[PDB]
Design a protein around this ligand. Structure first.
Ligand SMILES: *[C@@H]1O[C@H](CO)[C@@H](O[C@@H]2O[C@H](CO)[C@@H](O[C@@H]3O[C@H](CO)[C@@H](O)[C@H](O)[C@@H]3O)[C@H](O)[C@H]2NC(C)=O)[C@H](O)[C@H]1NC(C)=O
Ligand SMILES: *[C@@H]1O[C@H](CO)[C@@H](O[C@@H]2O[C@H](CO)[C@@H](O[C@@H]3O[C@H](CO)[C@@H](O)[C@H](O)[C@@H]3O)[C@H](O)[C@H]2NC(C)=O)[C@H](O)[C@H]1NC(C)=O
Ligand SMILES: *[C@@H]1O[C@H](CO)[C@@H](O[C@@H]2O[C@H](CO)[C@@H](O[C@@H]3O[C@H](CO)[C@@H](O)[C@H](O)[C@@H]3O)[C@H](O)[C@H]2NC(C)=O)[C@H](O)[C@H]1NC(C)=O
Lengths: 149, 110, 128, 149
């Protein structure tokens, strides 16, 4: 949260390596004397974000959604693709051609992406995500003043 | 110093007492919480200086948050909620009157 | 799709903190049962079924704790925090009857005083 | 404002309880220049170092801070297999505080062919400073102009 301007800023940090790979057979921290590139970006989220979690799968072939709780009680899931560090400022040819959206620091809370339609949690202490067995199913249980699954 | 904020919300129809059930208002979100009256009014006390966004929370008909700026001298200035811009858009009177449009769309249509 | 599948494979259970100040008045007593807890939540249980009729959550970090609770024939009076803000609730319906701002003291005791016929004043005594 | 830092190295069979003075490091806070000056190793120390390398031991470095004690461990097997090449990095706060140091070797291998007495005569080290970096904020001013234009 920023004191200068009354707002909540959203910073996403990502680690990226170069074009050439290392041994890539056995990983160890004794070796690998390199410094990975760090990417940072900023967004605006008009909420408090009491709780926060990521959907975790067994194999990890589906998308990576971020579950965020609100003081209201509704839990909203948003895709990691929107909050990506590789967001060019000016629209360039190849970036728009492959898969990208122009960068804009405005995130709106859509009512359609509301898991909690009627059932709300008064106090969102935390949420637990458990990977199921099929491929693309995660069991989300929100605990606190009430229990909801 | 401490100040108090008053407000009054009106539903399109039905009954004020029916909508009063399970209805609260947030000033910051977890810091200051206000409760509604029998027909409708939120009155909040024990508030320090600063600017806060008042929003009425309800699983039923929702409301538009309103930004309120509080001065030490005692001037109250209400404006629309603006994040990209940080200027004065349009000025409205202090007697907060929120007008709920209706039920928010929770389910998609196929 | 969500409106079609309302409650097929989802469930919510609503819970309440430890009972601190509960009353078993209401001589008519249809289903009313008031409970105010130590987690700054005030709820109403049902004698017959047991579900929640109306429940209110204000605070829970360090303030808003309930100190004392009085019960009239139809209305409930309670004091939150430590003697700064007081609000009265109803039981037929649920919401606020009235609110009062107290002074800067240490909440010790409260009572009902009745002039000649019935109670019209509540006495609140602080440290000084 | 020039301050000296004490740099000790460790050398044992499998444990580590002996520390000896290796050299002096000069650090000037206002400029940001870091200089090293260490003495040369004796023949007995070189032989002990070679014996430790074949025993895949550990190379602990102690740097007292004015108190605190910072230690860093580095495999010496790669140091002996390759040429002597250590890289030192100091970590500081926004003010005159010391977090710690890390020793990093560019080769970082495990082949282990052979070491010649000509190789281990001079010490090849480089000292660097890594002050905290300020993250960027929301670039909304450019977005507003892009929307207007
Ligand atoms: C990438 O990392 C892997 C795993 O650390 C390296 O493979 C391993 O390399 C070591 C060293 O060459 C092998 O050790 C060998 O042990 C035998 C006795 O068992 C000894 O006679 C040899 O002289 C050697 O020391 C180890 O077996 C080997 N492991 C496997 C599974 O192959 C690999 O060399 C690394 N590659 C690069 C490019 O760094
Ligand atoms: C949020 O929950 C409330 C309940 O507290 C929902 O209102 C009730 O919704 C149920 C269905 O979800 C309605 O039941 C219906 O009853 C008719 C017969 O009256 C039956 O033919 C239908 O098949 C269905 O079972 C119930 O009438 C309704 N009650 C009221 C007073 O409206 C509310 O719809 C929920 N919000 C949603 C779904 O967005
Ligand atoms: C003593 O330390 C200095 C500096 O650390 C060493 O100079 C460095 O030497 C290496 C190879 O000997 C150079 O690596 C080269 O990198 C370029 C790309 O930058 C690559 O194209 C070459 O094929 C090669 O890999 C390095 O640039 C150079 N300078 C540094 C690291 O700042 C010096 O070799 C050391 N002396 C001994 C005897 O080890």
């Amino acid at each position: 949260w920023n004191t200068k301007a009354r707002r909540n800023e959203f910073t996403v940090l990502e680690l990226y390596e170069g074009t050439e790979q290392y041994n890539a057979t056995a990983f160890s921290s004794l070796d690998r004397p390199q410094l990975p590139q760090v990417l940072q970006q900023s967004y605006i989220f008009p909420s408090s974000i009491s709780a926060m979690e990521a959907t975790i799968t067994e194999r990890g072939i589906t998308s990576r959604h971020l579950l965020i709780g609100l003081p209201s009680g509704a839990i909203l899931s948003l895709p990691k693709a929107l909050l990506d560090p590789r967001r060019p400022e000016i629209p360039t040819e190849q970036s728009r051609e492959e898969n990208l959206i122009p960068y804009s620091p405005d995130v709106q809370i859509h009512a359609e992406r509301f898991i909690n339609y009627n059932q709300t949690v008064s106090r969102m202490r935390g949420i637990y995500t458990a990977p199921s067995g099929l491929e693309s199913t995660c069991l989300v249980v929100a605990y606190g003043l009430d229990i909801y699954q | 110093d401490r100040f108090k904020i008053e407000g009054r919300a009106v539903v399109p129809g039905v009954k004020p007492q029916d909508w009063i059930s399970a209805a609260r208002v947030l000033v910051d979100g977890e810091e200051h919480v206000g409760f509604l009256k029998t027909d409708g009014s939120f009155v909040v006390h024990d508030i320090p200086s600063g600017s806060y966004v008042v929003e009425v929370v309800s699983p039923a008909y929702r409301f538009d948050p309103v930004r309120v700026d509080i001065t030490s001298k005692g001037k109250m200035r209400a404006r629309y909620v603006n994040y990209i811009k940080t200027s004065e858009v349009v000025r409205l009177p202090y007697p907060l009157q929120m007008k709920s449009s209706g039920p928010p769309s929770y389910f998609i249509k196929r | 799709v969500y409106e079609d599948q309302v409650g097929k494979f989802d469930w919510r259970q609503q819970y309440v903190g430890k009972v601190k100040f509960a009353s078993l008045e209401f001589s008519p007593g249809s289903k009313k049962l008031v409970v105010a807890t130590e987690k700054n939540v005030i709820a109403a249980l049902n004698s017959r079924t047991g579900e929640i009729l109306w429940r209110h959550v204000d605070k829970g970090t360090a303030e808003g704790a309930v100190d004392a609770m009085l019960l009239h024939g139809q209305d409930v009076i309670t004091v939150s925090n430590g003697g700064r803000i007081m609000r009265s609730w109803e039981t037929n319906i649920g919401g606020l009857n009235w609110e009062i701002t107290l002074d800067s003291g240490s909440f010790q005791a409260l009572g009902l005083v009745g002039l000649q016929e019935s109670v019209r004043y509540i006495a609140v005594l602080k440290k000084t | 404002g020039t301050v000296g830092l004490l740099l000790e190295h460790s050398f044992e069979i499998d444990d580590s309880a002996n520390f000896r003075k290796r050299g002096s490091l000069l650090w000037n806070q206002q400029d940001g220049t870091l200089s090293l000056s260490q003495r040369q190793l004796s023949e007995e120390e070189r032989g002990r170092l070679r014996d430790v390398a074949a025993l895949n031991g550990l190379y602990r470095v102690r740097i007292p801070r004015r108190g605190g004690y910072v230690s860093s461990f580095v495999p010496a097997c790669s140091l002996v297999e390759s040429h002597l090449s250590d890289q030192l990095t100091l970590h500081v706060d926004v003010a005159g505080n010391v977090v710690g140091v890390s020793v990093v070797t560019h080769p970082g291998g495990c082949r282990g062919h052979e070491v010649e007495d000509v190789d281990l005569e001079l010490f090849n080290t480089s000292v660097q400073l890594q002050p905290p970096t300020t993250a960027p904020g929301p670039e909304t001013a450019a977005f507003i102009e892009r929307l207007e234009m």
